[PDB]
Amino acid sequence: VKKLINSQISLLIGKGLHEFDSLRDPEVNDFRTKMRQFCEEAAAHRQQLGWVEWLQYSFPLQLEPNRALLVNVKFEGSEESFTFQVSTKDMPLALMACALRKKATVFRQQPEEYALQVNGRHEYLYGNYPLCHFQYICSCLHSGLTPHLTMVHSSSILAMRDEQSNLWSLEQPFSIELIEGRKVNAMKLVVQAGLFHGNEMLCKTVSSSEVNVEPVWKQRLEFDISVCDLPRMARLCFALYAVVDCPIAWANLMLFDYKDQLKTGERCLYMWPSVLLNPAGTVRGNPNTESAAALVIYLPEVAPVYFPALEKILELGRITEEELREILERELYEHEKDLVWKMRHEVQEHFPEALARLLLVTKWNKHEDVAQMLYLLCSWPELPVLSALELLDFSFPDCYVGSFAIKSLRKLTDDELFQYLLQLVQVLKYESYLDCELTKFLLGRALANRKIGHFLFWHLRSEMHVPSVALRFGLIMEAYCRGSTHHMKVLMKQGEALSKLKALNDFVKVSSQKTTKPQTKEMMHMCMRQETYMEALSHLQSPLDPSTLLEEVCVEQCTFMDSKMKPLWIMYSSEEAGSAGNVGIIFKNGDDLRQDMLTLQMIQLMDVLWKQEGLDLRMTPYGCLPTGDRTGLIEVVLHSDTIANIQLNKSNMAATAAFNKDALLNWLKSKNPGEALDRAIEEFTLSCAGYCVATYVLGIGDRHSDNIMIRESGQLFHIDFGHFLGNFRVPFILTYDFVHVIQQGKTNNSEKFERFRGYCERAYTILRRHGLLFLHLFALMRAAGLPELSCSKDIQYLKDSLALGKTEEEALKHFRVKFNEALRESW
Ligand SMILES: Cc1csc2cc([C@H](C)Nc3ncnc(N)c3C#N)c(-c3cccc(CN(C)C)c3)c(=O)n12
């Protein structure tokens, strides 16, 4: 039933669908209808995809950014398997041919008709790529583990597809009548009003008269800008404050509606509380109409006037110094700005990637200048992905510019889209209207790729407790669900597990304050062994990675950390995956995990860029996902311990040492006996170099032995990222105990130590080359509202850390000084 689906979406998204109809908002109604049709169209296209196309949608390939290898292969409808010896250069089709020839000798009598599933995972090996190019095979080679694959026939893939079915005349200056206000404060009240195009003012800010603290103004506010000169994306901003400075509230609105009509007349603005004008703030009123301060205003009836159509704009827009023009196109003076504007046609024809610089010099408060800009923009060639990411920033608020950025971003591969999905979702917070190119783009890509769909859902769902986005995000999630009824049910199962984990964690938090850890753990186990818990916590796709299946919860191995937020440690097992089904998740409630996730995704991007230059620093890109209000999951890295635990140098252990400095190296030796130690020290050195560079570039502070971990392989990694971008200028950090392992336990080992400095330098030089990408991504991230990523000073931190202004030689000299200063600071 359609009524059951509506109740299922309401429970899933955390907002009743009946709440959308109650708003009596035509913009909400049109978004709902239009996006339902768009998403149902994508669903219709999906149900008819060929079986290889269904594989690409549901299990997109996980590829890396000669030698012999053993692979265990079984068929779907059999327990029997065969261990084959293939090459790392061999294609999956060669492996499938071997599997079918071996099955032919057993059963006594087409590789193209199969795909190779990774046992116990929603992950497949298919296509013309050597086995070593697959992330699963690559991971198996580094750990020494044998790949375990399953031959799945095309009929079985199709069975999965089927089961998962669904104007220029108005020259008068702009003016408003400020009628009256509302709510309490301590003084007189002043309403400051500003007209903006993004962060930049269209005219000077004008204030109304001071009135003592239900205020009544009934005052005319006039602005130094003509009505015909108002850009399409013009934003009228307000700030209500008190004076003898005491900020009270703020409110913004678009001067044109979603249907391009210039707004008239009376508007009641339900204001948002403050920390004075906030141009980047939402243009939708505070939904808490009971307690919110309100500001009533009147927009004069200029008569029904709409913003001129594109055909009209283009018609109006249609109507040796080259040396200095080139040098400035690599903050600028007023004469330089006029040079760019005068030679705008030459920018289009010979310097198209300088469009951003041209957009920042155009006079957005003059409609003739805008029409001239838009005429060039509509015939402007498509720009690279890097250029388009810059154009998504609030510094480029025009709708045609926004539509241009999206058009250039259609060439993003699913892998690049996934890499930047977090920032693209944050850009939605800068959006002026509900129906927009970015939402249509995100919804389209999400419905064409199940992994993208999963993370788009969770990035939106985890922000539903935030009033300023709840409406927009709820509507996008409802639209998505219309596009995939099956994935909606898959996501509901995840939500049911998270609901139980929250309830379980609340119980643990209460119990842990009354009794011992063994007693709370046994009580946690008793709660989990209840049928409702056993059922809800088992057989789901991990919110951290939909390719990871969490089969049977292993209650005996579940525990909690008897500190701070009392996070839970949840273990799983799967007979179908064998040792690969043994995975864990950490559930944590009480901390905002958004910065933790951003820090880990930024380190993961560093790893990708390094690998693209053939540099593998053996990083540990474990998952971290916010799922709700101060709630999230962390992927467990098994076979790892904290540096602090190892450094405790406990007795009757294989790691016990004569000197504390040897505990870490002895731990490594105990986990890597004989010939394996060399490989382990190498893994430690590489990862130590990656994390030294990463923590330095990102300004990660408060680093101690309790928030640094080591894998049994030797790979070092970081946990509990509470602080970044120097928010307590953090120096480069070298630790003597780590230098000691690098130096193979020798006091003097310049050969090993300088190989390590070489790793650090190469890692650093690579990131500098992609410096602009980090700046563009962090600029989009400002939209998230993270307190450590609020201003220009936070972005300036990356510029200084990557030394972007300097030359490669100057930067490397400067980095070498910071490394030497850290080496001297290390005892
Ligand atoms: C019970 C529990 C609930 S949350 C939690 C976290 C951790 C560690 C700190 N973090 C991580 N571990 C693995 N993968 C990760 N991605 C993280 C993270 N982030 C441990 C833990 C693990 C091993 C060794 C010790 C040291 N102990 C013996 C003194 C602690 C732990 O036991 N728990």
XYZ file of C-alpha atoms and ligand atoms in Angstrom, residues 517 558-562 566-570 584-588 600 620 622-623 634-638 640-642 644-646 648 650 706-707 709 717-721, ligand 1:
74
model
C 32.453 -2.817 34.555
C 30.469 -6.763 22.838
C 31.606 -4.320 25.522
C 31.874 -0.605 26.325
C 34.705 1.809 27.223
C 34.206 2.677 30.918
C 30.704 5.163 27.514
C 30.943 4.230 23.755
C 29.863 0.678 22.817
C 32.064 -1.892 21.059
C 29.789 -4.121 18.848
C 33.081 -4.408 14.590
C 31.399 -1.045 14.964
C 31.760 1.545 17.704
C 28.573 3.374 18.622
C 29.066 6.700 20.350
C 39.323 11.323 8.449
C 44.259 3.268 7.892
C 38.634 3.609 8.901
C 35.042 4.836 8.703
C 33.224 4.385 14.016
C 34.603 1.359 12.147
C 36.617 -0.945 14.453
C 40.235 -1.524 13.342
C 40.857 -5.045 14.629
C 45.320 -2.967 17.013
C 46.241 -1.460 20.395
C 46.816 2.015 21.752
C 49.622 4.165 25.764
C 48.577 0.529 26.496
C 51.794 -0.876 24.912
C 52.493 0.607 30.089
C 53.299 -4.631 31.779
C 46.103 7.451 24.251
C 44.874 8.790 20.846
C 47.100 3.343 17.746
C 46.994 5.572 12.893
C 45.171 8.376 14.787
C 41.962 8.370 16.766
C 39.718 10.857 18.645
C 40.212 13.973 16.457
C 35.434 -0.903 24.310
C 35.563 0.265 23.397
C 34.529 1.041 23.069
S 34.952 2.323 22.022
C 36.577 1.745 22.066
C 37.599 2.313 21.423
C 38.916 1.722 21.524
C 40.026 2.423 20.793
C 40.584 3.469 21.749
N 39.605 3.119 19.573
C 39.492 2.347 18.404
N 39.777 1.035 18.393
C 39.617 0.394 17.232
N 39.220 0.923 16.073
C 38.928 2.228 16.098
N 38.515 2.833 14.907
C 39.045 2.981 17.252
C 38.711 4.368 17.222
N 38.426 5.490 17.143
C 39.130 0.610 22.270
C 40.433 -0.040 22.393
C 40.878 -0.899 21.407
C 42.092 -1.547 21.538
C 42.858 -1.331 22.667
C 42.419 -0.472 23.658
C 43.239 -0.271 24.899
N 42.563 -0.755 26.109
C 42.676 -2.202 26.222
C 43.232 -0.190 27.273
C 41.203 0.171 23.523
C 37.989 -0.007 22.993
O 38.192 -1.016 23.657
N 36.763 0.626 22.837
